[PDB]
Symmetry: C3
Subunit: 279 residues, 3 copies
């Protein structure tokens, strides 16, 4: 275990493509290429100061939109019908997201930077709030890193969408694998009608911007359990198995009927030899 | 720039009336026939004392209960403490506030500063379920010396399934000009949890809703879960980095969105116009 | 006089714990047979302490001990999948450890174990402990950091589904203090529902200790807090500070919940023992 890799300064202009596609069984998803849509959608990362142009195409037969949390966008990128920012069937649009660093305002106040654990999702499918689109799966993680932020080995996204994790059948996970000592990042997003409490066995994080204590000064409560509600996003990083060891470490919503009905997954933490004790 | 709050400590006095409004609604007001939902904004600087000369203008008992401020049990505003007000009655409710400081035990005593609220504790039940439903609630802000002052303050209450007891899809909308420093007080009441969301803007989840400086670890959010009696606030620079537009705020619980808990933060260009609206 | 503070930890400690049936379908944890309570006994450790829990299952159904926030190996997870439950009549030793904060090799700052936590059954009735938790097997755990301020008294309030501590509606509990006492509350939530915890006449910081660290701590100061199953938090107040003696209500603020009896009293006495208006 050596010194942490950290995020560099941003400010570069970046470009991707995104498609909205019908998937099997009435689901809909975002993808970086036609035929490539996933639920959750592709993870988008940026460094504070980066600009992102998303060349967007709706391949479906209903209007769809891309709406993002926390980042800078003009009203023309709001991704709503009210702002005439949605996309007709077979149409395209360029959505532009911007980000900025923190800094002293001319009025003496300190302007918060864009950095955080955020998300994007449809605002027009089935209702003008994207209720149907979100149900069907159009949602995905966005991470904006501040310069100096600690980088993980792997990032995993867990979305509680109504009664499902990542729109999966009950009791299907997903499961994520790590090796003891790995620095693992989780993005935790909630959607739909219901409140949840996210819980992770054998690990804990700080309730704050990065999910990690900035040092001894940081008062933030340290927690393994966090209540969340539709459109909430937070994130954190743990050292897999730290002080605990290898094992199949459950994560799950802690609402009792929710865990019983199956919103449950495994953080599978292997010994260096690839074996998991007691699993 | 950035006007700030002065040091507190004055003794202050206001009149407050509970009154019936249209259709089974009830509200607090600063003058008879002037009641509003939400009630009048009460602002204090830490150390201030507030004497409230309270008159119940209605035909049923009512009370005034406040969160976070200093009050003796006789100002609790409950039946249980015999602090409520009979129909037609008057009472003086007293709220006090204090600054932070070191205690004799060595700990750090938190001051009164923050985003708080008041509301009835006796109407319809001994928890004020009927009164709160009917609209007796209002915002209270206590400022610490040095706190940044806004240009305008707006109160948004999620009360059960309504915003400020309005009919669905009625707003309210609030207007601003790009660059204005705008304060929001966000209160929740009733039966249900909600998630408050504002397009195009973000705030720090902390006492003032703003980062204190480069060392403040607080998560920066546009979406916040809230339950009955939850109280928070923040300030934004209107349109900062995003420009003008009709910027939606709304509950993010999907059916609540769909059922009309929605409003607009209307941010005008200097010329008074809103793009896309 | 200066507050008492928590000492450095690092001792190896040991206790016995029993799971046992109580009246009317209730189940509880206890320090001695016949002694089970709901909530179960308070367990208090200093960071670095190790705790060996010598556990006996007194009941006819398998039961388990699962804990939040503390370090434990998978063999102390307390779940069926890890084969850490305890057969009826059986015994097992569960081991919880704790650690202090400090720098990692990678240069980051490792969070310590300190906090307000809880333990409960993971096993009875479903493999999430739904029956067990409903029956009352849950309890508070506090892990203190060296230097943390210590109270005169600690009280545990658990919102479990629609009850406070599995008590009948409108039964409290009520807690007594004298004006000026330093009183600690551990607030835990279990079951199916979100709640909001509210305390009249007092307030705390929403943060690790429930108290502001000093003039630079940004944490919101609150009298009202939303919580959901398995959330835990705690705080300490000076009873009656700036307010005075009185019967100070606490309750869930969801209106139907308070109307239906999730309510209790923080009874703050004058030094002579009397409470005004009560
Ligand atoms: Cu929206
Ligand atoms: Cu859930
Ligand atoms: Cu657990
Ligand atoms: Cu959203
Ligand atoms: Cu109350
Ligand atoms: Cu809502
Ligand atoms: Cu949004
Ligand atoms: Cu209240
Ligand atoms: Cu579990
Ligand atoms: Cu409740
Ligand atoms: Cu209250
Ligand atoms: Cu648990």
């Amino acid at each position: 275990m050596g010194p942490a890799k950290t995020a560099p300064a941003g400010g570069e202009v970046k470009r991707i493509k995104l498609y909205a596609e019908r998937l099997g069984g009435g689901q809909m998803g975002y993808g970086l290429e036609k035929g490539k849509a996933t639920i959750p959608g592709p993870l988008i990362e940026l460094n504070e100061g980066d600009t992102l142009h998303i060349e967007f195409e709706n391949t479906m037969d209903v209007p769809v939109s891309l709406h993002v949390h926390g980042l800078d966008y003009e009203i023309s990128s709001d991704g709503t019908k009210q702002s005439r920012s949605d996309v007709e069937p077979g149409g395209t649009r360029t959505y532009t997201w911007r980000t900025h660093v923190p800094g002293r305002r001319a009025d003496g106040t300190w302007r918060a930077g864009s950095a955080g654990y955020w998300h994007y999702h449809d605002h027009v499918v089935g209702t003008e709030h994207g209720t149907g689109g979100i149900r069907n799966g159009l949602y995905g993680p966005v991470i904006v890193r501040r310069k100096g932020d600690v980088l993980p080995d792997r990032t995993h996204t867990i979305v509680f969408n109504d009664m499902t994790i990542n729109n999966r059948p009950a009791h299907t996970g997903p499961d994520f694998e790590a090796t003891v000592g790995d620095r693992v990042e989780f993005v935790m997003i909630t959607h739909g009608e219901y409140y949840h409490t996210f819980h992770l066995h054998g690990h804990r994080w700080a309730d704050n911007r990065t999910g990690m204590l900035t040092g001894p000064d940081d008062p933030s409560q340290v927690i393994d359990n966090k209540i969340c509600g539709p459109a909430d996003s937070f994130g954190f990083q743990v050292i897999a198995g730290e002080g605990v060891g290898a094992g199949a470490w459950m994560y799950h919503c802690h609402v009792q009927s929710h865990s019983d009905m199956g919103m449950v997954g495994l953080f599978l933490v292997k010994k260096p030899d690839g074996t998991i004790p007691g699993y």
